[PDB]
């Protein structure tokens, strides 16, 4: 039951999402190995993901978390890159979308830096790069990221390298 609604580049909502995408690019310690070498993106399209059942699944859990945390969901907007982005928008996030080998255990990972999530578009470590050219720094092929509403609740703070 998912429909995708295109945002116009003239829409304030398009513009604020693009700004979050562009302004959270950083350099990576791998010199661009996983995600490619770039300082900015060419945004081709921004679509709103509309699914009533998946939204109600989200808000139901958000209310459970908020009630366990003095009425504070601690909701953030965060990036997610994955080979399974098209499955996620149709079926919702679940255990099949977890990074099993992540440094904080098997869970679903999100980033404040869009460029961090960009490293996972073609798999862990960028996999073998784009399917057409086998290039982790492909400047031709179209990539997709999700910008997601995420309930953190009470979050365990891990200081890490």
């Amino acid at each position: 039951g998912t429909i995708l609604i295109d945002l116009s580049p003239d829409d304030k909502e398009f513009q604020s999402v693009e700004e979050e995408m562009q302004s959270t690019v950083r350099e990576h310690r791998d010199g661009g190995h996983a995600g490619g070498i770039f300082n900015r993106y060419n945004i081709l399209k921004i679509q709103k993901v509309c699914n009533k059942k998946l939204w109600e699944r989200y808000t139901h859990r958000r209310k459970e978390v908020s009630e366990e945390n003095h009425n504070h969901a601690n909701e953030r907007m965060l990036f997610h890159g994955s080979p399974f982005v098209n499955a996620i928008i149709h079926k919702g996030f679940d255990e099949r979308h977890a990074y099993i080998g992540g440094m904080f255990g098997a869970g679903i990972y999100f980033a404040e830096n869009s460029s961090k999530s960009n490293q996972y578009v073609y798999g862990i470590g960028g996999g073998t790069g784009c399917p057409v050219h086998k290039d982790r720094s492909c400047y031709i092929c179209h990539r997709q990221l999700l910008f997601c509403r995420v309930t953190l609740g009470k979050s365990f703070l891990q200081f890490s390298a």
Binding site: G107, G153, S160
Partner: protein
């Protein structure tokens, strides 16, 4: 998936070496995220 640490709903990975990196986060229940925007893009070659 693993479970959240007892008494918590997520984990925050705070960078402790790279002063320019922003935080990363992990949830252990898929119901705690909604994929609100799908962004299609290219990376741009610097110059």
């Amino acid at each position: 998936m693993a479970h959240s640490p007892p008494g918590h709903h997520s984990v925050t990975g705070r960078p402790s070496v790279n002063g320019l990196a922003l935080a990363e986060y992990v949830i252990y229940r898929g119901e705690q995220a909604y994929p609100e925007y799908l962004i299609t893009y290219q990376i741009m070659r610097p110059e």
